[PDB]
Amino acid sequence: MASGVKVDPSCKNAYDLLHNKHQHSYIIFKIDKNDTAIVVEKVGEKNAPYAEFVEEMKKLVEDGKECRYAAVDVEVTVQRQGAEGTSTLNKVIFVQYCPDNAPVRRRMLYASSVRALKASLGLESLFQVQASEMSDLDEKSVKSDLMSNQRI
């Protein structure tokens, strides 16, 4: 669950860019090179419809049983403090997309990449969710779960 997985500066730069600078909305990560480096798979502009998020990722997954990490800084709204109606907080959620049937070789690197990116990407206090199928990544879970822990 932890090993010498290389963290890339570019994707980390993108984290601050999306989270604080709101230059981007989401960024997908994958393990690049044999020397194992976590790097950008796909970045999305600040205005990115939920449909396009699925679309862009959908096409790159069909090659095989691929595992991809997704960190998205999205502002969902609740009814709470701030204003009586809409309490909006951008909670950058980390949703790792990987079926269990993924190749054990990559699976091991994947598992050892978890702790590495967890703290190192500034996702220390942020939530980490797992999704194995494209049906499960539907807002029915992701939107609902994140909406609660916006201020929790």
Side-chain angles (χ1 to χ4, degrees):
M1 292 184 62
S3 192
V5 185
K6 212 62 169 184
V7 290
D8 161 77
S10 305
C11 53
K12 175 50 177 62
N13 182 34
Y15 172 79
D16 294 88
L17 291 177
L18 55 88
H19 180 58
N20 291 89
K21 319 300 162 171
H22 52 88
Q23 177 194 88
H24 284 124
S25 50
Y26 72 90
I27 177 179
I28 307 178
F29 306 96
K30 49 71 158 48
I31 298 79
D32 186 41
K33 75 176 61 175
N34 287 270
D35 189 71
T36 53
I38 310 171
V39 78
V40 183
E41 175 70 320
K42 189 64 176 67
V43 297
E45 300 294 272
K46 207 292 175 179
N47 181 33
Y50 303 102
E52 294 205 85
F53 176 72
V54 182
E55 291 277 80
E56 293 292 82
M57 181 176 60
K58 167 265 302 293
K59 54 181 178 179
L60 58 85
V61 177
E62 74 166 292
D63 170 64
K65 293 175 290 182
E66 303 297 284
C67 60
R68 258 66 178 168
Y69 308 105
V72 54
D73 191 86
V74 58
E75 60 286 85
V76 191
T77 200
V78 282
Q79 181 178 269
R80 287 298 184 221
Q81 303 179 150
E84 51 176 86
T86 45
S87 190
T88 321
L89 295 82
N90 61 321
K91 190 56 65 79
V92 52
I93 184 177
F94 184 77
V95 186
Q96 52 185 212
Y97 300 107
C98 177
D100 187 89
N101 294 90
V104 180
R105 298 69 175 120
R106 170 187 285 161
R107 188 71 163 153
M108 172 57 179
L109 303 176
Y110 169 87
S112 306
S113 179
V114 179
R115 191 276 170 166
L117 52 77
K118 219 287 132 163
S120 192
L121 270 59
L123 297 171
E124 54 185 305
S125 316
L126 288 309
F127 299 93
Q128 181 261 274
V129 183
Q130 58 177 89
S132 307
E133 61 181 276
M134 69 182 183
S135 319
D136 187 58
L137 55 79
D138 185 77
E139 67 101 84
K140 56 92 187 179
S141 290
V142 184
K143 183 282 308 284
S144 309
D145 188 52
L146 184 64
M147 182 182 179
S148 184
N149 288 93
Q150 282 167 211
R151 62 97 65 199
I152 303 179

